[PDB]
Write an enzyme that holds these catalytic residues in place. Structure first.
Site, PDB file in Angstrom:
ATOM      1  N   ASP A 160      37.688  -5.573 -13.297  1.00 53.85           N
ATOM      2  CA  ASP A 160      37.450  -6.967 -13.622  1.00 53.85           C
ATOM      3  C   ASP A 160      37.366  -6.890 -15.141  1.00 53.85           C
ATOM      4  OD1 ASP A 160      34.951  -9.533 -12.759  1.00 53.85           O
ATOM      5  OD2 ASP A 160      36.015  -9.221 -14.636  1.00 53.85           O
ATOM      6  N   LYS A 169      38.728 -33.953 -33.154  1.00 50.61           N
ATOM      7  CA  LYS A 169      38.642 -32.644 -33.797  1.00 50.61           C
ATOM      8  C   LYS A 169      37.684 -32.656 -34.985  1.00 50.61           C
ATOM      9  CE  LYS A 169      41.278 -29.534 -31.712  1.00 50.61           C
ATOM     10  NZ  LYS A 169      41.681 -29.568 -30.279  1.00 50.61           N
ATOM     11  N   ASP A 183      31.849  -7.064 -11.694  1.00 45.84           N
ATOM     12  CA  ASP A 183      30.595  -7.617 -12.198  1.00 45.84           C
ATOM     13  C   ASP A 183      30.228  -8.879 -11.432  1.00 45.84           C
ATOM     14  OD1 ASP A 183      31.741  -9.612 -15.060  1.00 45.84           O
ATOM     15  OD2 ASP A 183      32.767  -9.082 -13.207  1.00 45.84           O
TER      16      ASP A 183
END
Ligand code: MG
Ligand code: RB
Ligand code: RB
Ligand code: RB
EC number: 7.2.2.13
Lengths: 46, 998, 29
Positions: free
Chosen positions: B351, B462, B692
């Site tokens: 992972d 933005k 995980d």
């Protein structure tokens, strides 16, 4: 099951070959000391 | 309720969803008022029909069927068929079960306990390993806020039926799977599904990758992180998306642990001769020339003289050690055998996020001064800073600091600046933290320059800015600062820093800028534009009134200060620890639900990929995809998107999987990680998986060996794994593949020997039939070598260290290179087993010789009802020397034979200490072995002079020589194999000797 | 045997006593 499945056996009897006389001898020289006709050891009636 | 290729194989599929339908269609489908809710009457009317919203652990609670394994366990079959047959002996007795009362009955209860005990080790090898669904069902919330017949009411999640609408606030776990019909600023954390942590948002409408990626669905495990929403339960519990998984990553089973499956292939071979002789003589001998009770006493012997009583119980220990050895270095183990599987390992599946990378947005680079910079992308290590000299950075510093909403929670005294608690979000905290490695504390810098006005973070338009007051009472009294998309920011300035000056923006730098950008984007890290401006005084006197959300102060012609890129960096170790696994010919693969770009850029980062991307040469030449590209597969590696793995067949994967070392499939559904693992496995290999998050659960099971991640892992991922790295040091995989590979070897040695002495234990009874020469070795005597003498030495072998650059050889295949085999047997049953045989057989004679030697005599039935009536070689042996005629084998012979076996076992436990190196140019420093070799030899004597128990045992031999008998032999042993090893060598490729290497 | 009685066992204590006195001594190495 194995190419020349034979050799493996050959160098296998030679083994028991020598492994045998070796038993012989260790047993030969074993006796070459037993005694004179056979000794006898610590055991008695009671 | 059908077969298994359906009850636990209906996850090879993923889709099948209706959320891409009009609220009208939705409403109609579930027949539920999308605002008044659902009718309570109708509610239960459905619960009592569909069945509670909750998961149900698998039907399992057996604490026996596993204990009671020995009823096949090891060699407990013959032992049982033996100790029952030798439990019959004590029965078939006439004139008041004489001494046979002591023998037999006892040897029955003894071999009896053995089986029982040989099980506890053939048990502690597989401690109760289960409980996945446990955590899953413990991930659903307890309460739930749903709307019904008008009001909003709260109840037990279990009581949520399909069809009604529920409201979810930020910080709650999604009750069930639901299609949101409306929301406001909703952002859900999909970790447990995507594997990624950054919050996603929820829109009532939308569409996209039809099911998992559409912003109008909320998932079972996940939870809302901010905002609010109302949706309609499209799936409840066991039927949800995480339910399908919760079920799958539970009802699914791994199988045979390589090392533990090797505890098979030999347990058979040994048990093969276990009868080929065992019964052979019961037949080809017991030919009504011996009494029934005879054959059987002879049967229960070869049995005992065959099943290495002390051995499985030995490997168990050999495991137990290499476990209690790695745990001192962490990487705890929950399942023993795993230890030696990690070594047999051929492929690793990882992972990316959370495992390889540390899962924490960190500033990777910076573009201060027309030049690039790199930082301690680690967990506080080397590399050290980028500069911190040029005044330019000085500025950039504050910017990132002030233009920020981040902080920390508790007092956090622990210096882990990087492991401290964030508040805002990755992107930002990433920055805050970066400004703590150096430039003191931001909290103080935040108060240094007080904020008077701030324009909220990116509001579609933005950028983000705020004006603070500068304390440097000299230059401007007002400093405004802003950051946002790199493009935007830049294209709204007019001058940029340089060591401190302010040369104007233009064409010259607008270039090196784009470079830096695209040149950084390439590494796949997110980049932000930073810039500030000092509002002129004669334009803004102190106290000037700035209008918040309203135009009022400059925005263009600002000063561009720099660029900053952040990313999810590789753990400290991960970098080369991967290369090491390659050093060891292990193949790896990246199984990640994250997106392509990242996955690949990160793959290249940790060696997982070197040179030769597929889709790249596509451009680096014959500008195309098919053509002279695809077919040629001139590419050693590639990146496979899950979107495509969905439309592939068994073999299709095979091809892709084993035609190049891509090492990376991206954006993958949990099932996919497994279907991937399977495919690796279906090609006769031993794969390990490192994870995980919960999205791994499955793959962390079908995988031969599973490696969690201690802290970086879900209170489940671990529950599914075998190994639990508790320091998250991804290098333990190597300090595990080694330690594992070690015990493979350090087990053969430990086993070969532990049975070579089997021969010296059978032969007696075998000769005992071919020529009625009195029981040389005793049954009650056999159970005292493998299960009493060679004990500690077998164990000891384990401790024996290396023999070469192990991490230099290809993974040990599992179909050919076995554990036990001819190579072994031939060299331990048909070679040394013999030489030892003579030795103790030789001693047998001397033990009689110097008492009444019959090297030509002997060969005779030695009855005991007669009493005296006969003898041999000038004697009267009877009631006196009858009780005594056997005192030469009972108290004696057996004893001297016994010791002679020990005595030959020395040189065995030294010729097997090594597998290819003369004990000479090879460590002879096995402190353990040594101090055991004596702890054996000694026991021997204590067991040979023990003033009392010598009754239920043997007797006082003549120390001066009743010992040295075998001594002449132990040598030949040592002398023999020592040559072959040296033989094996002078002629490397070897002939018959290496052909029968070992 | 007025010899290996209370004397053949002391010999069974020269390499045993090195088990909780010398093997137990690999820590102070
Ligand atoms: Mg993860
Ligand atoms: Rb045995
Ligand atoms: Rb497993
Ligand atoms: Rb044995």
């Amino acid at each position: 099951t194995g190419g020349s499945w034979f050799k493996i056996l050959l160098f296998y009897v030679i083994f028991y070959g020598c492994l045998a006389g070796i038993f012989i001898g260790t047993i030969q020289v074993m006796l070459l000391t037993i005694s004179e006709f056979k000794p006898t050891y610590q055991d008695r009636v009671a | 309720a059908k077969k298994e290729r359906d009850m636990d194989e209906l996850k090879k599929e993923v889709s099948m969803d209706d959320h891409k339908l009009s609220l009208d269609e939705l409403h109609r489908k579930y027949g539920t008022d999308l605002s008044r809710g659902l009718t309570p009457a109708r509610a239960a009317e459905i619960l009592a029909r569909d069945g509670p919203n909750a998961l149900t652990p698998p039907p399992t609670t057996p604490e026996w069927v596993k204990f009671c394994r020995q009823l096949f366990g090891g060699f407990s079959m013959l032992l049982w068929i033996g100790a029952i047959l030798c439990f019959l002996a004590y029965g078939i007795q006439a004139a008041t079960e004489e001494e046979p009362q002591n023998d037999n009955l006892y040897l029955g209860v003894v071999l009896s306990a053995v089986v029982i005990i040989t099980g506890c080790f053939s048990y502690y090898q597989e401690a109760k390993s289960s409980k996945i669904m446990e955590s899953f069902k413990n991930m659903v919330p307890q309460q739930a806020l749903v709307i019904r017949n008008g009001e909003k009411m709260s109840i037990n999640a279990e009581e949520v039926v399909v069809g009604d609408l529920v409201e979810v606030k930020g910080g709650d776990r999604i009750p069930a799977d639901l299609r949101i019909i409306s929301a406001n600023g909703c952002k859900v954390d999909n970790s447990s599904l995507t594997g990624e942590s950054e919050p996603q948002t929820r829109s009532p409408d939308f569409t996209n990758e039809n099911p998992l990626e559409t912003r109008n669905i909320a998932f079972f495990s996940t939870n809302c992180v901010e905002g609010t929403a109302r949706g309609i339960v499209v799936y409840t519990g066991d039927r949800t998306v995480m339910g399908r998984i919760a079920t799958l990553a539970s009802g699914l089973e791994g199988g045979q642990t390589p090392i533990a499956a090797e505890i098979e292939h030999f347990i058979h071979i040994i048990t093969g001769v276990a009868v080929f002789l065992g019964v052979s003589f019961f037949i080809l001998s017991l030919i009504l020339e011996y009494t029934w009770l005879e054959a059987v006493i002879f049967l229960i012997g070869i049995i005992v003289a065959n099943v290495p009583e002390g051995l499985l119980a030995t490997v168990t220990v050999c495991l137990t050690l290499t476990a209690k050895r790695m745990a001192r270095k962490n990487c705890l183990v929950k399942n023993l055998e795993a230890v030696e599987t990690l070594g047999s390992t051929s492929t690793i599946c990882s992972d990316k996020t959370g495992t390889l990378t540390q899962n924490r947005m960190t500033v990777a680079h910076m573009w201060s001064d027309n030049q690039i910079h790199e930082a301690d992308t680690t967990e506080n290590q080397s590399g050290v800073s980028f500069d911190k000299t040029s005044a330019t950075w000085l500025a950039l510093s504050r910017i990132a600091g002030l233009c920020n909403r981040a902080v920390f929670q508790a007092n956090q005294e622990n210096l882990p600046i990087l492991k401290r608690a964030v508040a805002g979000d990755a992107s930002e905290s990433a920055l805050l933290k970066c400004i703590e490695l150096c430039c003191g504390s931001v909290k103080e810098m935040r108060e240094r320059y007080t904020k008077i006005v701030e324009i909220p973070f990116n509001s579609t338009n933005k950028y983000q800015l705020s004006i603070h007051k500068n304390p440097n009472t000299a230059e401007p009294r007002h400093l405004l600062v802003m950051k946002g998309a790199p493009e935007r920011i830049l294209d709204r300035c007019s001058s940029i820093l340089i060591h401190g000056k302010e040369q104007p923006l233009d064409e010259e730098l607008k270039d090196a800028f784009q470079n830096a950008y695209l040149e950084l984007g390439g590494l796949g890290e997110r980049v932000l534009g930073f810039c500030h401006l000092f509002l002129p005084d004669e334009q803004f006197p102190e106290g000037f009134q700035f209008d918040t959300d309203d135009v009022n102060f400059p925005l263009d012609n600002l000063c561009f200060v720099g660029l900053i890129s952040m990313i999810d960096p590789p753990r400290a170790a991960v970098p080369d620890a991967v290369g090491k696994c390659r050093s060891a010919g292990i193949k790896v693969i990246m199984v990640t639900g994250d997106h392509p770009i990242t996955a690949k850029a990160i793959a290249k980062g940790v060696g997982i990929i070197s040179e030769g991307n597929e889709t790249v040469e596509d451009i680096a030449a014959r500008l195309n995809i098919p053509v002279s590209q695809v077919n040629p597969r001139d590419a050693k590696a590639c990146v496979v998107h899950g979107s495509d793995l969905k439309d592939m067949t068994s073999e299709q994967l095979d091809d892709i999987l084993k035609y190049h070392t891509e090492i990376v499939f991206a954006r993958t559904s949990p099932q996919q990680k497994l279907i991937i693992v399977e495919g690796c496995q279906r090609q006769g290999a031993i794969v390990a998986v490192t994870g995980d998050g919960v999205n791994d659960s499955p793959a962390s099971k079908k995988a031969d060996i599973g490696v969690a991640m201690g802290i970086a892992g879900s209170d489940v991922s671990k529950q599914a794994a075998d190994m639990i790295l508790l320091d998250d040091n991804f290098a333990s995989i190597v300090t595990g593949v080694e330690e594992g590979r070690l015990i493979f070897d350090n087990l053969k040695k430990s086993i070969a020997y532990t049975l070579t002495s089997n021969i010296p234990e059978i032969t007696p009874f075998l000769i005992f039939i071919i020529a009625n020469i009195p029981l040389p070795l005793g049954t009650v005597t056999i159970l005292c070598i493998d299960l009493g003498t060679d004990m500690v030495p077998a164990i000891s072998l384990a401790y024996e260290q290396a023999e070469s650059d192990i991490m230099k050889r290809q993974p040990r295949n599992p179909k050919t290179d076995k554990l036990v085999n001819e190579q072994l047997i031939s060299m331990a049953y048909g070679q040394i087993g013999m030489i030892q045989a003579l030795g103790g057989f030789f001693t047998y004679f001397v033990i009689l010789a110097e008492n009444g030697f019959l090297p030509i005599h002997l060969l005779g039935l030695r009855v005991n009802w007669d009493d005296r009536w006969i003898n041999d070689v000038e004697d009267s042996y009877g009631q006196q020397w009858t009780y005594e005629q056997r005192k030469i084998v009972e108290f004696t012979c057996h004893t001297p034979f016994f010791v002679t076996i020990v005595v030959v076992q020395w040189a065995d436990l030294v010729i097997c200490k090594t597998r290819r190196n003369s004990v000479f140019q090879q460590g002879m420093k096995n402190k353990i072995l040594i101090f055991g070799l004596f702890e054996e030899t000694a026991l021997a004597a204590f067991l040979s002079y023990c003033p009392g128990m010598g009754v239920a045992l043997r007797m006082y031999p003549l120390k001066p020589t009743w010992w040295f008998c075998a001594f002449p032999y132990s040598l030949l042993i040592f002398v023999y194999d020592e040559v072959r090893k040296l033989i094996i060598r002078r002629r490397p490729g070897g002939w018959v000797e290496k052909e029968t290497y070992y | 045997y007025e010899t290996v009685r209370n004397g053949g066992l002391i010999f069974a204590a020269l390499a045993f006593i090195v088990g909780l006195i010398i093997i137990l001594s690999k820590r102070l190495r």
